[PDB]
């Protein structure tokens, strides 16, 4: 599990059948609410890549390399050949979509992937409704391998075609995209996949990645199959396809989530009892490799209470190894800044984007600590220092992926970020 690659696409161009075309495996769950135009889950696929004097980008199916993103026009390339397909790198594509409702999904599985690919839509209006919104949450978690995955010019008219992408790249000052060059794709016509799908893997090296450090895992899945009227021996833990960021996860590897449910007389944070967890079962995307390489995703099977893994209320819990370097205090500070627009809908008024509502007293707060949105009532918070008030004694490592949500309607907003000391 060496390198992850993340397609990142904002509102309204389509991210279902184009995930089917070039990545192979599409994302599906139960009571899923899977998409309306683009998806709302992590679109993940299982890949083993090989190149055999061939610029094409094949799948672990070892016969052809095409897709199904258009019904009429098929340009195609030299696919490869059979013969017990090989493995250049332990790579696997992942996706991070761009609505503002998936803050759990868009904030938990984005710092844990390795390479990023930002997409530009092709089914939206002449103003840019959400181009400067859905990698600005990825701004603070500081990914490096980022590219403009240029997507749609097919049904795009000529008046809004060849220059406005530069205006989108200039409009994304809150998005780290100036060091993101362009390797284009096509969501419909998928033209000439041997160079189009080539340097999204071939140009991208390993990221800066630590081999043998602590596995300080923020988990992305905790799912379970124990419906009313179930089997007898489903003793498991977090049944997960789990992307890891740091630390080698071998058999017998140690990893701890220290608070979980907060200890007795719940106003302290730690008691010296580590959480012993031996992860043996590890599914390397088509195989059972118990020795997990850092960075890439692997199918993680832990051993904890099975009752606690049915409904994943644990989006982004810190599971870290021995040597408990995370902090112990309940007075959370941040070094924040503000979102300059109040955008997510397009208009020409500049009226809802008037100001930035700061912290107050007798007034609520919520912010995705990693992907955990807690809060409470405040007492006296100053002007330019962010003092987040909470209720959960959690020995989290670094909340360097936070989004200050704020109510204006049925949906919350985006007003802030921040980096932990």
């Amino acid at each position: 599990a060496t390198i992850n690659i993340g397609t990142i696409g904002h509102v309204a161009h389509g991210k279902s059948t184009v995930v089917k075309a070039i990545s192979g495996v599409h994302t599906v769950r139960f009571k899923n609410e899977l998409e309306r135009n683009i998806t709302i889950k992590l679109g993940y696929a299982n890949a083993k890549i090989y190149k055999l004097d061939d610029p094409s980008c094949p799948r672990p199916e070892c016969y052809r390399s095409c897709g199904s993103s258009t019904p009429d026009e098929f340009p195609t390339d030299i696919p490869g050949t059979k013969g017990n397909f090989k493995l250049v790198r332990h790579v696997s594509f992942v996706d991070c979509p761009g609505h503002d409702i998936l803050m759990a999904t868009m904030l938990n599985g984005a710092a844990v992937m390795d390479a990023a690919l930002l997409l530009i839509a092709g089914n939206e209006s002449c103003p840019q409704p959400q181009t400067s919104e859905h990698l600005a949450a990825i701004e603070i978690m500081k990914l490096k391998h980022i590219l403009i995955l240029q997507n749609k010019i097919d049904l795009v008219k000529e008046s809004q075609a060849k220059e406005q992408y530069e205006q989108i790249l200039a409009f994304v000052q809150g998005t780290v995209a100036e060091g993101a060059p362009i390797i284009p794709i096509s969501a419909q016509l998928k033209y000439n996949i041997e160079v189009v799908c080539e340097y999204i893997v071939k140009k991208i090296p390993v990221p800066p990645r630590d081999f043998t450090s602590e596995p300080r895992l923020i988990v992305i899945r905790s799912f379970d199959v124990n419906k009313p009227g179930c089997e007898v021996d489903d003793l498991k833990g977090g049944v997960a396809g789990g992307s890891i960021l740091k630390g080698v996860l071998k058999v017998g590897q140690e990893i701890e989530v220290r608070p979980g449910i907060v200890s007795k007389d719940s106003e302290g944070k730690l008691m010296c009892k580590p959480i012993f967890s031996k992860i043996v079962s590890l599914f390397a995307e088509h195989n059972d490799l118990q020795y997990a390489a850092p960075g890439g995703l692997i199918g993680v099977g832990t051993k904890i209470d099975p009752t606690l893994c049915r409904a994943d209320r644990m989006v982004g819990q810190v599971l870290g190894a021995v040597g408990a370097l995370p902090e112990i205090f309940t007075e959370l500070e941040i070094s924040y800044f503000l979102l300059r627009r109040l955008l997510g809908v397009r208009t020409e008024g500049d009226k809802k984007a008037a100001k930035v509502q700061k912290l107050s007293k007798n007034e609520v707060l919520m912010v995705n600590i990693g992907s955990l949105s807690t809060g409470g009532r405040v007492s006296a918070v100053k002007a330019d220092l962010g003092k987040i008030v909470l209720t959960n004694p959690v020995c989290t490592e670094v909340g360097e992926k936070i989004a200050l949500s704020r109510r204006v309607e049925k949906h919350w907003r985006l007003i802030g970020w921040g980096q932990i000391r």
Binding site: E73, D154, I182, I183, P184, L189, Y191, V195
Partner: peptide, 16 residues
């Protein structure tokens, strides 16, 4: 890249 200019030389002879 040669693929944008490849499309504007090759594939847009039949496309709108």
């Amino acid at each position: 890249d040669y693929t944008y200019e490849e499309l504007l030389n090759r594939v847009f002879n039949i496309m709108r």
